[PDB]
Amino acid sequence: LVANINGGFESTPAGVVTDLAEGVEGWDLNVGSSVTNPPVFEVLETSDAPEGNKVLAVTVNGVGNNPFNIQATALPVNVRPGVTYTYTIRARAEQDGAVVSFTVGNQSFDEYGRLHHQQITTEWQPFTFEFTVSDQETVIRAPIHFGYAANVGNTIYIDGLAIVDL
Numbered sequence: 001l002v003a004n005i006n007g008g009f010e011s012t013p014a015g016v017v018t019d020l021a022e023g024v025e026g027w028d029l030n031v032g033s034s035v036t037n038p039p040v041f042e043v044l045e046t047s048d049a050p051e052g053n054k055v056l057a058v059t060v061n062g063v064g065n066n067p068f069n070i071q072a073t074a075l076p077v078n079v080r081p082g083v084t085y086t087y088t089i090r091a092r093a094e095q096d097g098a099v100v101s102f103t104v105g106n107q108s109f110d111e112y113g114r115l116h117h118q119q120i121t122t123e124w125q126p127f128t129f130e131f132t133v134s135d136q137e138t139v140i141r142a143p144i145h146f147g148y149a150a151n152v153g154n155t156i157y158i159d160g161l162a163i164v165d166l
């Protein structure tokens with residue numbers, strides 16, 4: 001059982017994402033208002049997909065006030081208080097030098113854990129951490145943050161988010 005839905009983008013038709021809010025089931029891709037140069041989100045069919053046939057590509061053309069202004073959040077993430085989950089995802093970038101934070105938190109924005117400010121290379125890597133649901137929440141979120149200025153001009157690819165009981 002996986003806590004998150006559509007973790008590998010296989011539920012979504014290929015193409016540029018034109019409905020950030022609802023166009024990728026299991027995810028919210030809304031952009032913060034402080035961003036003035038829009039990013040591009042695209043579900044890509046590709047033979048190097050770590051799983052299945054699709055990945056999500058995020059082209060960062062500019063940043064805003066906080067790195068969370070360019071983001072992909074998995075939701076809902078269905079969990080149980082007390083349980084420790086393993087988070088795993090695959091990521092790479094068009095150019096070495098990209099930076100991503102992989103986070104999990106509640107609908108209050110309190111975080112349970114993160115992998116902070118990770119360097120992303122041109123080759124796929126698994127990024128993994130454990131976290132415990134430490135409050136009473138059963139429906140949480142998994143925000144991925146791309147809006148670091150180091151990413152401007154780059155494209156970050158993600159696939160295979162799986163949040164699983166340890």
Ligand SMILES: *[C@@]1(O[C@H]2[C@H](O)[C@@H](O)[C@H](O)O[C@@H]2CO)O[C@H](CO[C@H]2OC[C@@H](O)[C@H](O)[C@H]2O)[C@@H](O[C@@H]2O[C@H](CO[C@H]3OC[C@@H](O)[C@H](O)[C@H]3O)[C@@H](O[C@@H]3O[C@H](CO[C@H]4OC[C@@H](O)[C@H](O)[C@H]4O)[C@@H](O)[C@H](O)[C@H]3O)[C@H](O)[C@H]2O)[C@H](O)[C@H]1O
Nearest residue numbers: 066067068069071073101108109110111114116141143145
């Ligand atoms: C967390 O602290 C980090 C710290 O930032 C690091 O520097 C450090 O080393 O580690 C700690 C954790 O151990 O920071 C989170 C934000 O991180 C991102 O921005 C800051 C940057 O330094 C960092 O690199 C980057 O990853 C923060 O979560 C954010 O919380 C925002 C709300 O903040 C309040 O409530 C939670 C409290 O903890 C804070 O003190 C309060 O100010 C929240 O902002 C809201 O975002 C809305 C949009 O949301 C959607 O898009 C962004 C997605 O992240 C989100 O899932 C989507 O739903 C917007 O509409 C609101 O107006 C805005 O307030 C951010 O979404 C959330 O990511 C952690 O709380 C904090 O512990």
Ligand SMILES: [Ca+2]
Nearest residue numbers: 008051052054
């Ligand atoms: Ca996939």
